[PDB]
């Protein structure tokens, strides 16, 4: 069995000539030569079975990626695992090799307005599909937007995804949250569990801002700091927006802050296309009920050269506490289609 950094990475005989990429979110990633399709691919080794949280996230990711089929969403090409539950200790997920990601690109490359426009279009087209499936991604950020050498953009990492549940979105002030801090919507810190589509649009708006300047717009260092970054640019919420926040601790926190005026986008982003900044404003709207929706964003004048709703498909099959032993069996079942025979 082939080794990579002295750990087993046994994908053969189909996958050979391995090169290390990284130590992943949790699990090692290599490129490898696919000897069937005659192209290099990406492979991630996952070893989740001792922990119910890792079983849950792995199962969730696999079920979603296998159900989805869209040019702006990473697909699963193959899944390698043992023929029996008892022998199954790792799972290998095979994807198209994506040479970079928006995180890497932003650390080194100035993006043209044409690239920003194209990347935003692709993000929203993929997101239209995800949301049409009643799914929230909940961890959109540059490193979760993969790109290949022709700049095809594919959303990945559905580990924190959920079925949308607006009727159970409410919670109290300072309720703990798991998704990446810099791309969290203001309401997460105030009164939201992140079970509405508007959570994802905020993250997209953060990404657009980042594309414009190569720097995160709201780099908070700790839970409440993230909200305070947001308010520093958007300015104090209006009375009407505060009236929407019934929770007293959340509303009173916002009323305790000194009045702060809006920082105009065109001062933050003096080289930006004016239509890009109009769309940015609408995605980075404090009130989630007033925030633009994905399909509305696609129809925005900024994207008019790409907008084509007939070429922006929706999902055919929208989605509607298990011990790790049951989750292992479900992962075994979910990966069965890739085993030799059919």
């Amino acid at each position: 069995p082939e080794m990579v950094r002295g750990q087993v990475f046994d994908v053969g005989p189909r996958y050979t000539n391995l090169s290390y990429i990284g130590e992943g979110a949790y699990g090692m990633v290599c490129s490898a030569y696919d000897n069937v399709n005659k192209v290099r691919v990406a492979i991630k080794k996952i070893s989740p079975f001792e922990h119910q949280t890792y079983c849950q996230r792995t199962l969730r990711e696999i079920k979603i990626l296998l159900r989805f089929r869209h040019e702006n969403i990473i697909g699963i090409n193959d899944i390698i695992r043992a023929p029996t539950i008892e022998q199954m200790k790792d799972v290998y997920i095979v994807q198209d090799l994506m040479e970079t990601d928006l995180y890497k690109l932003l650390k080194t490359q100035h993006l043209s307005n044409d690239h920003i426009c194209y990347f935003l279009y692709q993000i929203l087209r993929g997101l239209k599909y995800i949301h049409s499936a009643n799914v929230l991604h909940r961890d959109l950020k540059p490193s979760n937007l993969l790109l290949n050498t022709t700049c095809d953009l594919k959303i990945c990492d559905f580990g924190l995804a959920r079925v949308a549940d607006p009727d159970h979105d409410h919670t109290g002030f300072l309720t703990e949250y798991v998704a990446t801090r810099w791309y969290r919507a203001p309401e997460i810190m105030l009164n939201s569990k992140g079970y509405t589509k508007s959570i994802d649009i905020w993250s997209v708006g953060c990404i657009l801002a980042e594309m414009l300047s190569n720097r995160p717009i709201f780099p908070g260092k700790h839970y409440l700091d993230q909200l305070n970054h947001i308010l520093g640019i958007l300015g104090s919420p209006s009375q009407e927006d505060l009236n929407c926040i019934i929770n007293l601790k959340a509303r009173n926190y916002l009323l305790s802050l000194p009045h702060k005026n809006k920082v105009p986008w065109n001062r933050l982003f003096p080289n930006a296309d004016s239509k890009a900044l109009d769309l940015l404003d609408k995605m980075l709207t404090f009130n989630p009920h007033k925030r633009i929706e994905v399909e509305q964003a696609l129809a925005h004048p900024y994207l008019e050269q790409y907008y084509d709703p007939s070429d922006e498909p929706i999902a055919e099959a929208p989605f509607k506490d298990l011990p790790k032993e049951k989750l292992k069996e479900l992962i075994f079942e979910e990966t069965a289609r890739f085993q030799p025979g059919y």
Side-chain angles (χ1 to χ4, degrees):
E2 277 196 73
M3 305 288 288
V4 179
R5 280 162 158 77
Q7 288 200 322
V8 305
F9 208 90
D10 180 22
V11 292
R14 177 164 180 184
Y15 304 103
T16 60
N17 194 28
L18 313 174
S19 327
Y20 180 80
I21 284 165
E23 196 57 290
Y26 245 96
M28 181 177 312
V29 176
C30 294
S31 55
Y33 183 67
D34 182 345
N35 289 89
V36 167
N37 296 139
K38 311 292 185 61
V39 291
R40 286 190 71 73
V41 291
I43 310 179
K44 187 175 172 203
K45 179 181 187 189
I46 313 201
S47 301
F49 296 120
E50 304 299 293
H51 289 117
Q52 92 93 19
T53 184
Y54 285 94
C55 284
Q56 275 192 250
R57 286 184 182 142
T58 299
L59 177 59
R60 184 192 311 283
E61 175 115 65
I62 293 167
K63 292 171 76 73
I64 295 162
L65 290 178
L66 290 181
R67 171 92 65 100
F68 290 178
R69 190 179 180 107
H70 191 280
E71 293 157 20
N72 301 116
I73 308 169
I74 197 61
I76 291 180
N77 298 356
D78 195 2
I79 302 180
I80 307 157
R81 48 78 166 161
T84 64
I85 290 160
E86 294 93 335
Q87 297 171 288
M88 180 177 65
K89 301 193 150 60
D90 312 295
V91 182
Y92 303 84
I93 303 180
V94 186
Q95 297 181 339
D96 291 352
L97 176 61
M98 301 299 275
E99 291 84 350
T100 195
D101 62 61
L102 190 58
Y103 177 88
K104 289 181 182 170
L105 217 45
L106 291 178
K107 48 180 197 227
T108 53
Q109 299 306 318
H110 174 72
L111 310 189
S112 75
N113 179 59
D114 287 343
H115 283 88
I116 296 171
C117 191
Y118 182 47
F119 293 171
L120 183 64
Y121 177 68
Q122 291 185 85
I123 293 162
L124 290 166
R125 183 174 180 272
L127 194 58
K128 172 187 179 179
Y129 182 95
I130 298 163
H131 284 182
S132 78
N134 205 37
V135 170
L136 314 176
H137 183 289
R138 300 178 72 248
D139 198 20
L140 292 166
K141 59 186 174 173
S143 61
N144 286 337
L145 305 174
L146 309 182
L147 293 113
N148 66 11
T149 55
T150 46
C151 305
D152 298 324
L153 181 156
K154 297 184 181 291
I155 299 164
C156 69
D157 192 353
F158 287 81
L160 301 183
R162 295 293 188 277
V163 173
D165 191 5
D167 295 352
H168 293 272
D169 191 62
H170 201 270
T171 189
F173 175 54
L174 309 176
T175 295
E176 295 274 52
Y177 202 67
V178 299
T180 312
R181 193 188 310 118
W182 296 351
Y183 306 92
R184 291 178 193 164
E187 61 273 15
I188 295 301
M189 290 74 78
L190 296 166
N191 69 353
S192 171
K193 292 195 283 199
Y195 290 170
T196 71
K197 290 176 186 173
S198 62
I199 206 73
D200 283 336
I201 294 300
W202 180 271
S203 303
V204 174
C206 292
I207 294 164
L208 176 53
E210 201 159 340
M211 289 195 286
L212 287 169
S213 61
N214 295 80
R215 305 174 74 192
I217 184 171
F218 309 123
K221 295 173 166 35
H222 61 259
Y223 184 94
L224 188 52
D225 197 38
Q226 189 58 33
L227 176 57
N228 295 333
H229 272 259
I230 294 168
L231 303 175
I233 296 304
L234 274 47
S236 301
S238 64
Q239 190 65 60
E240 172 156 291
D241 283 354
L242 290 182
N243 288 343
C244 300
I245 298 175
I246 202 165
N247 184 273
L248 274 167
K249 277 179 176 172
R251 196 189 293 186
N252 283 333
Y253 174 69
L254 294 171
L255 293 172
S256 81
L257 297 172
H259 178 214
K260 179 76 171 54
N261 285 110
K262 192 167 177 70
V263 182
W265 297 118
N266 77 357
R267 292 184 203 176
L268 287 169
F269 302 113
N271 199 27
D273 186 297
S274 66
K275 297 177 177 164
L277 296 183
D278 187 73
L279 182 50
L280 182 59
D281 187 66
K282 288 172 171 49
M283 293 199 288
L284 297 182
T285 287
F286 177 79
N287 185 340
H289 304 108
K290 300 179 177 166
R291 197 169 302 147
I292 198 168
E293 294 207 334
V294 66
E295 294 175 27
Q296 191 175 15
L298 284 163
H300 185 276
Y302 183 55
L303 301 173
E304 62 197 318
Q305 302 162 301
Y306 292 103
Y307 179 54
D308 182 359
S310 81
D311 191 38
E312 296 156 6
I314 65 170
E316 293 183 340
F319 280 89
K320 291 162 279 187
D321 288 20
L322 276 51
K324 70 201 175 279
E325 285 84 8
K326 292 281 160 201
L327 292 169
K328 182 175 199 191
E329 311 167 39
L330 295 175
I331 288 161
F332 189 82
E333 286 176 359
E334 202 62 32
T335 58
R337 71 204 80 183
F338 297 100
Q339 291 294 120
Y342 57 94

